Amino acid sequence: MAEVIKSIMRKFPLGVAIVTTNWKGELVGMTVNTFNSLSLNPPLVSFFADRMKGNDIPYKESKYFVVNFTDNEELFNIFALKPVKERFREIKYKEGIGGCPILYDSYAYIEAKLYDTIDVGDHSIIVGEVIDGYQIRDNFTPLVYMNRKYYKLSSL
Amino acid sequence: MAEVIKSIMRKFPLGVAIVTTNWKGELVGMTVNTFNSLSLNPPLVSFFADRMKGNDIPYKESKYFVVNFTDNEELFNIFALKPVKERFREIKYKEGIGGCPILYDSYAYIEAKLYDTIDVGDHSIIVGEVIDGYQIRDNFTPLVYMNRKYYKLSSL
Ligand SMILES: NC(=O)c1ccc[n+]([C@@H]2O[C@H](COP(=O)([O-])OP(=O)(O)OC[C@H]3O[C@@H](n4cnc5c(N)ncnc54)[C@H](OP(=O)(O)O)[C@@H]3O)[C@@H](O)[C@H]2O)c1
Ligand SMILES: NC(=O)c1ccc[n+]([C@@H]2O[C@H](COP(=O)([O-])OP(=O)(O)OC[C@H]3O[C@@H](n4cnc5c(N)ncnc54)[C@H](OP(=O)(O)O)[C@@H]3O)[C@@H](O)[C@H]2O)c1
Ligand SMILES: Cc1cc2nc3c(=O)[nH]c(=O)nc-3n(C[C@H](O)[C@H](O)[C@H](O)COP(=O)(O)O)c2cc1C
Ligand SMILES: Cc1cc2nc3c(=O)[nH]c(=O)nc-3n(C[C@H](O)[C@H](O)[C@H](O)COP(=O)(O)O)c2cc1C
């Protein structure tokens, strides 16, 4: 059933973002395709963090996280492929709420306070309450992830 | 903060599906942009159901649900816009696990057993365990939803 899920999801296009946090002083983040809005009242957003890889731990142990929306495919690859210690060496960033890194190449971001975490199977649902949101750049090319690739939309 | 979420999400492209169930004999479904894979072991998928509109209730009160993947934008509009009583009159469908409707124009679908429901703010996270998955059609044009519109991918 695992390979059934992967085969169908491979052809199921999903928006991508880079979630980050300041985990006891360590700047960390990751490319995710599970980001969404969950609730409006209260205003909550969520993503799924892999428990087997320990991706849930930083968010569970930090009071805040940032969701970075970017159209730079290089950034998505960095925050998926490169060693954790190397990720924040190559990119321009500033610190935001709780010291969470805001990526310079983001056209928008959300600052969230950790609201809840719910372990369900081999992932944890990380839920943040939206404290602030920013649209920094109005001209961007939104990407979606499908079949290991990052596509632009035909046509806008 | 609600309008902050909406403004950012309006420019955040998301895959779309139509989840259905057989709710005590009533065929129901809805267009969702919150469908994703949650866990591989166990094999779990999820979507978010609006508690204020009562969209969570049918899934909570049924043992199974089906996730329909389709490239027919007319179907997405039916299962978003049209009255509940009218939806299954206009489309070809067959009954699957627990009587859940499988849409004929789906290029793939998943049959899931309700595994858990978790209320978080004004939505419930509906989690199903994948019992079976099918890829019926190999030639399709995957869509993503952004800014009230359904886009194809540039270019594949
Ligand atoms: N819900 C899940 O627990 C889960 C897990 C894996 C893949 N998937 C879905 O299946 C699709 C295709 O599978 P693939 O192996 O060919 O992935 P892929 O598109 O080649 O993605 C590259 C890597 O990122 C990781 N990844 C992608 N989505 C993830 C997620 N939802 N949770 C944890 N890790 C994730 C996977 O790690 P690993 O190879 O180490 O698993 C994967 O190898 C993915 O795009 C994803 O939507 C879902
Ligand atoms: N997470 C949430 O609770 C939630 C709620 C609404 C919108 N949003 C996000 O904000 C975006 C733009 O807002 P919009 O008002 O212009 O929506 P939209 O794209 O015009 O979508 C049309 C309608 O579908 C409903 N809808 C879309 N996504 C939903 C979801 N996640 N949960 C429950 N209902 C949903 C909304 O109902 P209503 O107008 O009655 O709210 C909306 O009016 C959406 O595309 C969606 O991603 C999220
Ligand atoms: C596009 C894509 C989507 C991903 N989505 C998720 C996700 O939603 N949840 C998750 O835990 N990991 C996801 N990953 C994997 C993480 O990005 C990755 O495990 C994280 O960057 C840490 O990398 P590492 O395990 O090699 O140290 C995704 C990877 C890619 C390529
Ligand atoms: C593309 C789009 C995505 C949607 N995503 C969701 C969702 O994830 N969860 C949800 O409860 N409703 C979602 N909706 C709203 C439902 O489709 C809608 O409430 C359902 O079809 C019942 O319609 P009704 O309230 O007019 O009877 C979405 C609507 C659209 C247009």
PDB file of C-alpha atoms in Angstrom, chain A residues 1-2 4-9 11-17 33-46 48 69 107-110 115 118 120-123 125 127 130-135 140 142-144 146 151-156, chain B residues 1-2 4-9 11-17 33-46 48 69 107-110 115 118 120-123 125 127 130-135 140 142-144 146 151-156:
ATOM      1  CA  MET A   1       0.000   0.000   0.000  1.00  0.00           C
ATOM      2  CA  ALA A   2       3.017   2.293   0.523  1.00  0.00           C
ATOM      3  CA  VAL A   4       0.289   2.515  -4.120  1.00  0.00           C
ATOM      4  CA  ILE A   5       0.392   5.858  -2.274  1.00  0.00           C
ATOM      5  CA  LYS A   6       3.718   6.882  -3.879  1.00  0.00           C
ATOM      6  CA  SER A   7       2.600   6.013  -7.435  1.00  0.00           C
ATOM      7  CA  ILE A   8      -0.612   8.035  -7.187  1.00  0.00           C
ATOM      8  CA  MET A   9       1.042  10.946  -5.329  1.00  0.00           C
ATOM      9  CA  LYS A  11       1.150  12.327 -10.453  1.00  0.00           C
ATOM     10  CA  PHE A  12      -0.674  14.522  -7.901  1.00  0.00           C
ATOM     11  CA  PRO A  13       0.567  18.096  -8.138  1.00  0.00           C
ATOM     12  CA  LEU A  14       1.215  19.866  -4.816  1.00  0.00           C
ATOM     13  CA  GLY A  15       2.250  23.362  -3.797  1.00  0.00           C
ATOM     14  CA  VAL A  16       5.615  23.572  -2.081  1.00  0.00           C
ATOM     15  CA  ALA A  17       7.010  25.755   0.694  1.00  0.00           C
ATOM     16  CA  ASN A  33       4.644  19.514  -0.027  1.00  0.00           C
ATOM     17  CA  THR A  34       2.156  19.053   2.835  1.00  0.00           C
ATOM     18  CA  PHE A  35       1.665  22.718   3.748  1.00  0.00           C
ATOM     19  CA  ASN A  36      -1.914  23.967   3.878  1.00  0.00           C
ATOM     20  CA  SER A  37      -4.341  26.194   5.688  1.00  0.00           C
ATOM     21  CA  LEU A  38      -6.274  24.237   8.318  1.00  0.00           C
ATOM     22  CA  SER A  39      -8.549  26.712  10.158  1.00  0.00           C
ATOM     23  CA  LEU A  40      -9.669  30.351   9.848  1.00  0.00           C
ATOM     24  CA  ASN A  41     -11.047  30.804  13.377  1.00  0.00           C
ATOM     25  CA  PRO A  42      -8.710  30.285  14.984  1.00  0.00           C
ATOM     26  CA  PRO A  43      -6.290  31.009  12.092  1.00  0.00           C
ATOM     27  CA  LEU A  44      -4.211  27.847  11.763  1.00  0.00           C
ATOM     28  CA  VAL A  45      -1.837  26.420   9.173  1.00  0.00           C
ATOM     29  CA  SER A  46      -0.243  22.993   9.087  1.00  0.00           C
ATOM     30  CA  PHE A  48       3.288  17.052   8.058  1.00  0.00           C
ATOM     31  CA  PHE A  69       6.839  30.859  -0.091  1.00  0.00           C
ATOM     32  CA  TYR A 107       7.828  36.463  -2.131  1.00  0.00           C
ATOM     33  CA  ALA A 108       5.674  35.845   0.950  1.00  0.00           C
ATOM     34  CA  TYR A 109       5.911  34.316   4.396  1.00  0.00           C
ATOM     35  CA  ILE A 110       3.849  33.466   7.452  1.00  0.00           C
ATOM     36  CA  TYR A 115      -0.395  25.557  18.410  1.00  0.00           C
ATOM     37  CA  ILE A 118      -0.498  15.353  16.536  1.00  0.00           C
ATOM     38  CA  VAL A 120      -0.583  10.061  13.225  1.00  0.00           C
ATOM     39  CA  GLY A 121       1.256   7.045  11.847  1.00  0.00           C
ATOM     40  CA  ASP A 122       4.838   7.811  10.791  1.00  0.00           C
ATOM     41  CA  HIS A 123       4.341  11.624  10.647  1.00  0.00           C
ATOM     42  CA  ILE A 125       0.882  17.108  12.026  1.00  0.00           C
ATOM     43  CA  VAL A 127      -0.091  23.068  13.482  1.00  0.00           C
ATOM     44  CA  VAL A 130      -0.799  32.530  12.236  1.00  0.00           C
ATOM     45  CA  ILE A 131       0.588  35.535  14.157  1.00  0.00           C
ATOM     46  CA  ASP A 132       1.528  37.560  11.070  1.00  0.00           C
ATOM     47  CA  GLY A 133       1.673  37.244   7.296  1.00  0.00           C
ATOM     48  CA  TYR A 134       3.563  39.239   4.674  1.00  0.00           C
ATOM     49  CA  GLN A 135       3.467  39.599   0.883  1.00  0.00           C
ATOM     50  CA  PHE A 140       6.389  35.855  -8.842  1.00  0.00           C
ATOM     51  CA  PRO A 142       4.341  29.995  -8.343  1.00  0.00           C
ATOM     52  CA  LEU A 143       5.623  26.421  -8.565  1.00  0.00           C
ATOM     53  CA  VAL A 144       4.058  23.027  -8.010  1.00  0.00           C
ATOM     54  CA  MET A 146       4.942  16.602  -9.276  1.00  0.00           C
ATOM     55  CA  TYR A 151       6.459  23.035 -12.740  1.00  0.00           C
ATOM     56  CA  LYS A 152       5.153  26.504 -13.507  1.00  0.00           C
ATOM     57  CA  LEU A 153       1.443  26.897 -14.257  1.00  0.00           C
ATOM     58  CA  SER A 154       0.125  27.105 -17.811  1.00  0.00           C
ATOM     59  CA  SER A 155      -0.522  29.971 -17.900  1.00  0.00           C
ATOM     60  CA  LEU A 156      -0.299  32.435 -14.977  1.00  0.00           C
TER      61      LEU A 156
ATOM     62  CA  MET B   1      -5.501  36.937  10.367  1.00  0.00           C
ATOM     63  CA  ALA B   2      -8.239  35.077   8.450  1.00  0.00           C
ATOM     64  CA  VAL B   4      -4.046  37.131   5.759  1.00  0.00           C
ATOM     65  CA  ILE B   5      -4.426  33.358   5.299  1.00  0.00           C
ATOM     66  CA  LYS B   6      -6.842  33.747   2.350  1.00  0.00           C
ATOM     67  CA  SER B   7      -4.647  36.290   0.516  1.00  0.00           C
ATOM     68  CA  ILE B   8      -1.527  34.125   0.728  1.00  0.00           C
ATOM     69  CA  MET B   9      -3.401  30.872  -0.031  1.00  0.00           C
ATOM     70  CA  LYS B  11      -1.548  32.537  -4.718  1.00  0.00           C
ATOM     71  CA  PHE B  12      -0.510  29.121  -3.336  1.00  0.00           C
ATOM     72  CA  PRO B  13      -1.190  26.418  -5.906  1.00  0.00           C
ATOM     73  CA  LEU B  14      -2.767  23.204  -4.576  1.00  0.00           C
ATOM     74  CA  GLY B  15      -3.706  19.857  -6.075  1.00  0.00           C
ATOM     75  CA  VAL B  16      -7.416  19.113  -6.069  1.00  0.00           C
ATOM     76  CA  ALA B  17      -9.450  15.936  -5.643  1.00  0.00           C
ATOM     77  CA  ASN B  33      -7.679  21.254  -1.950  1.00  0.00           C
ATOM     78  CA  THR B  34      -6.423  19.802   1.353  1.00  0.00           C
ATOM     79  CA  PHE B  35      -5.887  16.206   0.217  1.00  0.00           C
ATOM     80  CA  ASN B  36      -2.469  14.707   0.892  1.00  0.00           C
ATOM     81  CA  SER B  37      -0.606  11.604   1.905  1.00  0.00           C
ATOM     82  CA  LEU B  38       0.053  11.581   5.653  1.00  0.00           C
ATOM     83  CA  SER B  39       1.790   8.272   6.500  1.00  0.00           C
ATOM     84  CA  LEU B  40       3.338   5.297   4.670  1.00  0.00           C
ATOM     85  CA  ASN B  41       3.428   2.842   7.590  1.00  0.00           C
ATOM     86  CA  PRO B  42       0.633   2.651   8.273  1.00  0.00           C
ATOM     87  CA  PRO B  43      -0.521   3.893   4.828  1.00  0.00           C
ATOM     88  CA  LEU B  44      -2.683   6.926   5.574  1.00  0.00           C
ATOM     89  CA  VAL B  45      -4.135   9.785   3.550  1.00  0.00           C
ATOM     90  CA  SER B  46      -5.961  12.852   4.797  1.00  0.00           C
ATOM     91  CA  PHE B  48      -9.530  18.734   6.018  1.00  0.00           C
ATOM     92  CA  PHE B  69      -8.458  12.108  -8.969  1.00  0.00           C
ATOM     93  CA  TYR B 107      -8.048   8.677 -13.929  1.00  0.00           C
ATOM     94  CA  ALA B 108      -7.196   7.272 -10.492  1.00  0.00           C
ATOM     95  CA  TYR B 109      -8.796   6.684  -7.120  1.00  0.00           C
ATOM     96  CA  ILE B 110      -8.046   5.496  -3.607  1.00  0.00           C
ATOM     97  CA  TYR B 115      -8.819   5.613  10.535  1.00  0.00           C
ATOM     98  CA  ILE B 118      -9.177  15.099  14.723  1.00  0.00           C
ATOM     99  CA  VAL B 120      -8.512  21.293  15.127  1.00  0.00           C
ATOM    100  CA  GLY B 121     -10.067  24.751  15.081  1.00  0.00           C
ATOM    101  CA  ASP B 122     -12.942  25.083  12.600  1.00  0.00           C
ATOM    102  CA  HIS B 123     -12.012  21.941  10.581  1.00  0.00           C
ATOM    103  CA  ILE B 125      -8.683  16.256   9.850  1.00  0.00           C
ATOM    104  CA  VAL B 127      -7.640  10.405   8.043  1.00  0.00           C
ATOM    105  CA  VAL B 130      -5.510   3.151   2.174  1.00  0.00           C
ATOM    106  CA  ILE B 131      -7.147  -0.242   1.506  1.00  0.00           C
ATOM    107  CA  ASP B 132      -6.714  -0.135  -2.278  1.00  0.00           C
ATOM    108  CA  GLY B 133      -5.556   2.206  -5.025  1.00  0.00           C
ATOM    109  CA  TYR B 134      -6.174   2.189  -8.773  1.00  0.00           C
ATOM    110  CA  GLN B 135      -4.712   3.950 -11.817  1.00  0.00           C
ATOM    111  CA  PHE B 140      -4.416  12.692 -18.192  1.00  0.00           C
ATOM    112  CA  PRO B 142      -3.327  17.062 -13.890  1.00  0.00           C
ATOM    113  CA  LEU B 143      -4.832  20.291 -12.557  1.00  0.00           C
ATOM    114  CA  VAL B 144      -3.942  22.635  -9.731  1.00  0.00           C
ATOM    115  CA  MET B 146      -5.021  28.758  -7.493  1.00  0.00           C
ATOM    116  CA  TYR B 151      -4.510  25.474 -14.174  1.00  0.00           C
ATOM    117  CA  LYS B 152      -2.648  22.871 -16.193  1.00  0.00           C
ATOM    118  CA  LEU B 153       1.109  22.549 -15.674  1.00  0.00           C
ATOM    119  CA  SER B 154       3.606  24.174 -18.025  1.00  0.00           C
ATOM    120  CA  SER B 155       4.552  21.772 -19.431  1.00  0.00           C
ATOM    121  CA  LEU B 156       3.586  18.154 -18.634  1.00  0.00           C
TER     122      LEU B 156
END
